């Protein structure tokens, strides 16, 4: 019954039938994206209308289309033809990956480059990578992928150990022609293998680890109703899944006595970019938009009990569309469980004689995705005390290159002759806020140092200041770790019992933002990543910080364009966009498979409650 | 047999006997500090000689003494008379705290102040706090405590809810004299109670929490030998305990193949300061040096199984001296256990078809201390992948004041009429480094942004730079989160298989350092807290960043005096001192008992290993 329920297999089949009968899904058509639309703003929305948004690719070269369909009524709502040279290309299709390696295998320029290196073409894997927008005028309006080569010595070999440097090819995957093959010179192909399953590399496995058993003999403390509605320890929320963004959280609310109090209307990771910092022309174009160009949800892993998710696990199995409109289930794609989280509060009081200890817990909602060599885990945590936290876990295999003789300022050495170019992993969290309702504002809070003098004779005082962000043109903010800078989202019309506006404080990790030169292509296309915090006025169509069609878009779409409207954000329906990321100088310990590293952010209540919200937790 | 074993009850009794026999511990003497000395530099050295350092107070006013004793040989090694007006007072004795409230209860100025407020002296608790060094010349050379008053309505009442603002008293605890009583005016005593176990305040306790059972069917994976030597998942270390510093880690090493490789010789929290930022004369003197003035190990809690430490727990019960030299056991004062820590590494490879997942775990060594209203947890973590992390957990009851009717720039309101002054909690970690041995150096690593142009035509390149710190005068460093600044401790004489020096990288949280005016008393006494990182050359007597005698000591000791020696630190026996802390603007949710907040740091290997050190972890 819930408008926020997960898409079902039957819904996707109905969408396919509607498209087919409308003449929009012929044999030359492919679905590049399909997802359910959120309800529009309407607190009295009663009539159910489940609508789906679809991007339709044409493999014969005709213009693609954006289509909205109503599955409730069986109708096409709208269908518009897209001019991709203007508004950007559609996301990369899984089936286009294979095309790159196959086309190059018969190209005379590619074969001659491999022959010079004495490489068997049947052993050369090609990583198909997004193209971006650079100096090649012939690429405007065409679907381009770029390919980098790796050698696989045998079918189970890790090809990432054997990059073929000095060689790159560009491919039109619709006309199926190789536009350029660039050979800048012969580099030795690194010869050591990186097979982390090979006993010769691992040595004998440890026998010292004894089991840790985590069980819940009475079952978990949360309930799941209507397929994806969660109730847990005063929290209430809906767990969504979109093929582009992955797990999306809706309607995050907290039960304070007898009021259900909204906190966040919609939370998602709305973009993720991986820019590389190697100036070699072989790789200087390399920037993954894993969300916008590849769609992270379609590569979600099936998560194995006892290995990926340990404990008393409740799974969700989201359904997505394949390229032909058939439903595909991602079995066990989302793990949900609760975890002990140490001490919540503790005090031993000398004067009263009372000793008091309580334990903390968190609810975990997670999924894992694999995009080529990298694997990313996305974790949302809810804590007993009202804290909300996101954490990204980065693992997988580093992207490799040759390590030049004489060294490099932009590449790490991992093994003899084997390099790993410097890069970043930068995320954008889109937080459609609803602190006690939709009338919200953001304040920037800095620590204030005070000088010794009258009214501060001992020079010990310090203070803080808050600055309200009132218009979008002033709501593009930078971190300042030295002044303890945080941002407070408050509701000026909802006060706590002390007559102060209720709020939540965003705590950033204050990691570096995008390092590329401000005039670069990547800085224009990933403008969101150049600043830590953006605030916009809510609009239904402003969904992604990079725009709807990221692939081969020339730049400026998304947040720079939204912000330019300069709308009032002081006590309005607002959206917070937080940039955060990891700057990765690969170390030897990241090879041949990388131990997890993490980054994230959290939100803590700031006078939202009238006192601690966990006084009613029992002693166990 | 190990020279790093915990002090035994017999050793402490033997120290008492040696001091008594020597004429140093008559009835007027009190032991203010007693602890075991680490072995001097030298492998093997003088067979094995267990030496203890003792600070001896005299309750009749005679000069105190610092004494070193050999318990092995039954001898006093040295005994020096201290000039406390010059070099500082001894740490506060537990028996001196009780004196303050009793003395004030018979002072007519104190009684007159309470009568003016209609308060019954029998219900007034006095918090006895360290005095610091300010403008009162009569305090030089005397042991002073300052007292702030709180009303306890009944024996089980939380007195912290009822501060008596406008009133402070200073007490000479040796001569038993009230030196000054300062009354700046009557403030209403806040009337709401803060009794977090009162059902009237908690409401009915939750019935929704189902149990989480964490068990180890085959027992834990670590072994404890010789009382305090641990081996766990290739790590090797000794767990010490000192009444001043608390838990101290010795000889942290990692078994890499056949060789035991040192990493850290000694790790401790060597000072912690809690400065308050309220300029009211009632509190502008308030600064706790919990380690140096109070001795945090002395107030360690006994940790209860299932509440404080959950899982398969191994306890240590350290022994300390009471003020007369009798051994006192802190039963179950240190918890040790291993914990599951999620995914360690994961990759699903399209080309090889291999799916790979491994789980991480960490070893936890923890203790908790209670000093008045505050409770602090100290946590050391060792991870499978070579990471070492420290975390401080702050909880307890916030220190309160009246909330002034016109508002305040330096105090938060928590309840009607009840304030909580702004303050910080700042720690100093002393890391006696030994990366692959004692020849170490520190490099500061910053991200380097590059301009678009020749050799960087697409404006994507970025790099890093490392600066060696070669002398102590250049080794006082500040954080810079915007440039991703970290510090690398390396061994220039020990290279990995790529012929790079082995190293470890220190990752700070980049929180604000000390906020007080640089001219203030606290900035001079806690100079270490004004900078994020200090490096010194190792010396036996340079133990604490604030010096040996912190109580009522002006500046002149500690890190600023050590670094003036300007010693060579480039490939030498060095010590890293890292400042980190929390800046606390109390929120309503911190009342009436505060949920845990945390701060810490971590060290990660940086080319210490020749590849990932966790390739031999099994699937299980
Ligand atoms: Cu990376
Ligand atoms: Cu605090
Ligand atoms: Na909003
Ligand atoms: Na050292």
Swiss-Prot record, chains A, B:
UniProt keywords, alphabetically: Copper, Disulfide bond, Metal-binding, Oxidoreductase, TPQ
Biological process annotations from GO: amine metabolic process
Positions bound to substrate: 288-299, 371-376
EC number: 1.4.3.21
Catalytic-site annotation from UniProt: 290 (proton acceptor), 374 (schiff-base intermediate with substrate)
Record bears the keyword Oxidoreductase: yes
Subunit structure and binding partners: Homodimer.
Name of the protein in its database record: Phenylethylamine oxidase
UniProt organism field: Arthrobacter globiformis
């Amino acid at each position: 019954a819930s408008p926020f329920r997960l898409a079902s297999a039957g819904e996707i089949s109905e969408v396919q039938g509607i498209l087919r009968t409308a003449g929009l899904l012929g044999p030359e058509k492919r679905i590049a994206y399909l997802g359910v639309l959120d309800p529009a703003r309407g607190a009295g929305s009663e009539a159910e209308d489940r609508r789906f948004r679809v991007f339709i690719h044409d493999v014969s070269g005709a213009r693609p289309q954006e289509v909205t369909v109503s599955v409730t009524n069986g109708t096409v709502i709208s269908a518009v033809e897209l001019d991709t040279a203007a508004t950007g290309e559609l996301p990369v299709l899984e089936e286009e990956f294979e095309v790159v390696e196959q086309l190059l295998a018969t190209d005379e320029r590619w074969l001659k480059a491999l022959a010079a290196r004495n490489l068997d073409v049947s052993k050369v894997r090609v990583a198909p990578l997004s193209a971006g927008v650079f100096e090649y005028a012939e690429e405007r309006g065409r679907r381009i992928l770029r390919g980098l080569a790796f050698v696989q010595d045998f079918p189970e070999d890790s090809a990432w150990a054997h990059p073929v440097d000095g060689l790159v090819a560009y491919v039109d995957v619709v006309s199926k022609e190789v536009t350029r093959v660039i050979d800048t010179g012969v580099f030795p192909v690194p010869a050591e293998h990186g097979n982390y399953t090979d006993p010769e590399l691992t040595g004998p496995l440890r026998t010292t680890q004894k089991p840790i058993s985590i069980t819940q003999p009475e079952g978990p403390s949360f309930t799941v109703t209507g397929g994806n509605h969660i109730e847990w320890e005063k929290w209430s929320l809906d767990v969504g899944f979109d093929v582009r963004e992955g797990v999306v959280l809706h309607n995050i609310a907290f039960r304070d006595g007898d009021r259900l109090r909204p906190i966040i209307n919609r939370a998602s990771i709305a973009e993720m970019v991986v820019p590389y910092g190697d100036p070699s022309p072989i790789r200087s174009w390399q920037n993954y938009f894993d969300t916008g160009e590849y769609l992270v949800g379609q590569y979600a892993n099936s998560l194995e009990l006892g290995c990926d998710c340990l404990g008393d696990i409740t799974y969700l199995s989201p359904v997505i569309s394949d390229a032909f409109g058939n439903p595909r289930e991602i079995r066990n794609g989302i793990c949900m469980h609760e975890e002990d989280w140490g001490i919540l509060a503790k005090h031993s009081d000398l004067w009263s004689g009372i000793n008091y200890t309580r334990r903390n817990r968190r609810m975990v909602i997670s999924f894992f995705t694999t995009i080529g060599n990298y694997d990313y885990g996305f974790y949302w945590y809810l804590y007993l005390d009202g804290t909300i936290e996101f954490e990204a876990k980065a693992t997988g295999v580093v992207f490799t290159s040759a390590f030049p003789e004489g060294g490099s300022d932009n590449i790490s050495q991992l093994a003899p002759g084997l390099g790993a170019p410097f890069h970043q992993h930068i995320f954008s969290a889109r937080l459609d806020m609803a602190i006690d309702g939709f009338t919200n504002r953001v304040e920037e809070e800095d620590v204030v140092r005070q000088t010794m003098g009258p009214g501060n004779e001992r020079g010990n005082a310090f203070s803080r200041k808050r600055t309200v962000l009132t218009r979008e043109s002033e709501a593009v903010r930078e971190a300042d770790a030295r002044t303890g800078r945080t941002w407070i989202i408050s509701n000026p019309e909802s006060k706590n019992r002390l007559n102060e506006p209720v709020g939540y404080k965003l705590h950033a990790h204050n990691q570096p933002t995008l390092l590329a030169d401000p005039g670069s292509s990547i800085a224009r296309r990933a403008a969101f990543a150049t600043k830590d915090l953006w605030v916009t006025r809510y609009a239904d169509d402003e969904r992604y910080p990079t725009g709807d069609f990221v692939n081969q878009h020339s730049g400026g779409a998304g947040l720079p364009s939204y912000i330019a409207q300069d709308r009032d954000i002081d006590g309005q329906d607002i959206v917070v966009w937080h940039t955060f990321g990891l700057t990765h100088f690969p170390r030897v310990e990241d090879w041949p498979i990388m131990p997890v590293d993490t980054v994230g952010f959290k939100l803590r209540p700031e006078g939202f409650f009238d006192r601690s919200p966990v006084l009613d937790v029992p002693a166990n």
